[PDB]
Design a protein around this ligand. Structure first.
Ligand SMILES: *[C@@H]1O[C@H](CO[C@@H]2O[C@@H](C)[C@@H](O)[C@@H](O)[C@@H]2O)[C@@H](O)[C@H](O)[C@H]1NC(C)=O
Ligand SMILES: *[C@@H]1O[C@H](CO[C@@H]2O[C@@H](C)[C@@H](O)[C@@H](O)[C@@H]2O)[C@@H](O)[C@H](O)[C@H]1NC(C)=O
Lengths: 218, 50
């Protein structure tokens, strides 16, 4: 996240870090005690058997007792197109069920087909680059963003920070976009580099997949 | 070595630090294919005009 701020510890208890060899490579969202959702492109070309799903994290550079760690048991995808990053969403069933507590909680999803209009205020977050480069974030970052429809595909939800250069950045793939307490986006791609001030950041539109998500998790 | 032709244009870039690549140079691709960055990592693709 470029141009955002530190989250308060465990402010977003559904926020997940996907890790390989003990290193964060993508965000994810806890959507049931035993399921997370992320961007399909995150796992498309990694060994799914090697992925560690880290719940209850805040500072990736510290040992944290609040963490719960799982492996991926099963994978579900619904028409992911890697050329165009369409349907860039994956559900990963965990090899166990999280203990629900202060620091690990399940996210709430919008209704099927809900589309957000221009100007809706959302919150993006993640452990991606801070930009400068200030390098990667140790502490989870968050950023106020505005939904935009211009320079966005109908198959995405896009956001743009008003009047300054800020936005999601590399390492934020798969992270949730929260709008009015609901997960409406999964970070997918940028254009013109991070925080271009021109191109909206693009998210997989979670609301378009809710019936499919429920068909798996319910 | 690099081959004739150009890589196709792409719409945007996935938000991974290091998108996995399946090639690093054109010579690793068959026939006239080039090693090109897609939206998320490099792959062997047919060339477009230069
Ligand atoms: C769930 O998986 C946990 C992590 O397993 C470890 O990481 C994975 C990616 C593999 O490398 C595996 O060989 C490692 O052991 C386990 O610690 C945990 O016991 C598993 N829970 C079960 C079996 O319900
Ligand atoms: C920045 O955003 C803060 C949090 O936004 C609200 O909560 C998040 C989790 C989403 O549900 C989002 O849609 C909500 O708007 C606000 O509390 C704060 O007012 C915002 N700051 C400014 C300058 O307006």
């Amino acid at each position: 996240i470029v141009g955002g701020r530190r989250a308060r510890p465990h402010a977003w208890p559904f926020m997940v870090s996907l890790q390989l060899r003990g290193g964060h490579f993508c965000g994810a969202t806890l959507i049931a005690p035993n399921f997370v959702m992320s961007a399909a492109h995150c796992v498309a070309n990694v060994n799914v058997r090697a992925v560690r799903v880290v719940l209850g994290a805040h500072n990736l550079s510290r040992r944290e007792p609040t963490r719960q760690v799982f492996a991926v048991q099963r994978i579900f995808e619904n028409g992911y197109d890697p050329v165009n990053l369409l349907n860039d969403i994956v559900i990963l069933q965990l090899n166990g069920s999280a203990t629900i507590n202060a620091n690990v909680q399940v996210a709430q999803l919008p209704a099927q087909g809900r589309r957000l209009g221009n100007g809706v205020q959302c919150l993006a977050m993640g452990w991606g680059l801070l930009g400068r480069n200030r390098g990667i974030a140790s502490v989870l970052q968050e950023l106020n963003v505005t939904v935009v429809t211009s320079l966005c595909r109908r198959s995405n939800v896009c956001t743009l920070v008003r009047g300054r250069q800020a936005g999601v950045c590399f390492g934020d793939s798969g992270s949730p976009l929260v709008c009015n307490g609901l997960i409406h986006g999964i970070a997918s791609f940028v254009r013109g580099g991070c925080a271009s001030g021109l191109y909206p950041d693009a998210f997989a539109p979670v609301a378009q997949f809710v019936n499919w998500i429920d068909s798996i998790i319910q | 070595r690099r081959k004739p032709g150009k890589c196709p244009v792409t719409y945007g870039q996935c938000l991974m630090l290091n998108p996995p690549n399946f090639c690093e140079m054109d010579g690793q691709c068959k026939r006239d294919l080039k090693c090109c960055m897609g939206m998320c990592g490099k792959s062997c693709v047919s060339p477009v005009k230069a």
